[PDB]
């Protein structure tokens, strides 16, 4: 029984959230879960990984993410 | 304000540790338990217990070692899980 998910961390400096996500799951769900845990909508936040602002349809696989990678979240302009 | 609450070691042998926490929540998918030697980037081991569980046994420990024990509560959202504010304690075996 593999083991389909990787670990990701999303942080904004204060709020830090740990995710277990599939390589093939769109990051929309992670971005939505993080924003909405803030009581915000996905589109009020920007998510950064490797000099790139992540878009909702991208997967960890599209971005070559690795187990234990970190996503930076910040206020204003998504998505 | 850390979840689960009331994380503790309830029974301990030099190589073994029984921990419990408050599992009042009905929506928790599972608790993830990680443990390694305090400070040291010694390999952290992990296992999970379902969200209905409130105890777990950590065995295979070496005597006189300080461990950091962390418990994450994970929740489901579509096809992922996420966790915030894990609880940790230290315990010298």
From Swiss-Prot, chain A:
Q: Does the keyword GTP-binding apply?
A: no
- The protein's organism comes out as Saccharomyces cerevisiae (strain ATCC 204508 / S288c) (Baker's yeast)
| Designated name of the protein | Ubiquitin-like protein SMT3
Molecular-function GO term, any one: ubiquitin-like protein ligase binding
Q: Which UniProt keywords apply?
A: Acetylation, Isopeptide bond, Phosphoprotein, Ubl conjugation pathway
Q: Which top-rank group of organisms is this from?
A: Eukaryota
Q: State whether it acts alone or in a complex, and with which partners, per the record.
A: Activated by a E1 ligase composed of AOS1 and UBA2.
Other comments? Present with 2940 molecules/cell in log phase SD medium.
Q: Where does the Ubiquitin-like domain start and stop, copy by copy?
A: 4-79
**Can you name a GO cellular component term?**
condensed nuclear chromosome
Q: From its record, what is one biological process in GO terms?
A: protein sumoylation
Q: Does the keyword Phosphoprotein apply?
A: yes
Q: Which family does it belong to?
A: Belongs to the ubiquitin family. SUMO subfamily.
So what does this one do?
Not known; suppressor of MIF2 mutations.
* Residue range from the parent sequence: 19 to 97 of 101
């Amino acid at each position: 029984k593999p083991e389909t998910h990787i670990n990701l961390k999303v942080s904004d400096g204060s709020s830090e959230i740990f995710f277990k996500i599939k390589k093939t799951t769109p990051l929309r769900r992670l971005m939505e879960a993080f924003a909405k845990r803030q009581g915000k909508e996905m589109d009020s936040l920007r998510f950064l990984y490797d000099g790139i602002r992540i878009q909702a349809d991208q997967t960890p696989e599209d971005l070559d993410m690795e187990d234990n990678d970190i996503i930076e979240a910040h206020r204003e302009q998504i998505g | 304000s850390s979840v689960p609450t009331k994380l503790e070691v309830v029974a301990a042998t030099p190589t073994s540790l029984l921990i419990s926490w408050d599992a009042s929540s009905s929506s928790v998918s599972y608790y993830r338990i990680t443990y390694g030697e305090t400070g040291g980037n010694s390999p952290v081991q992990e296992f999970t217990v379902p969200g209905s569980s409130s105890t777990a046994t950590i065995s295979g420990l070496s005597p006189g070692v300080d461990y950091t024990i962390t418990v994450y509560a994970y929740y489901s959202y579509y096809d992922l899980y996420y966790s915030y504010s894990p609880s940790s304690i230290n315990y010298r075996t």
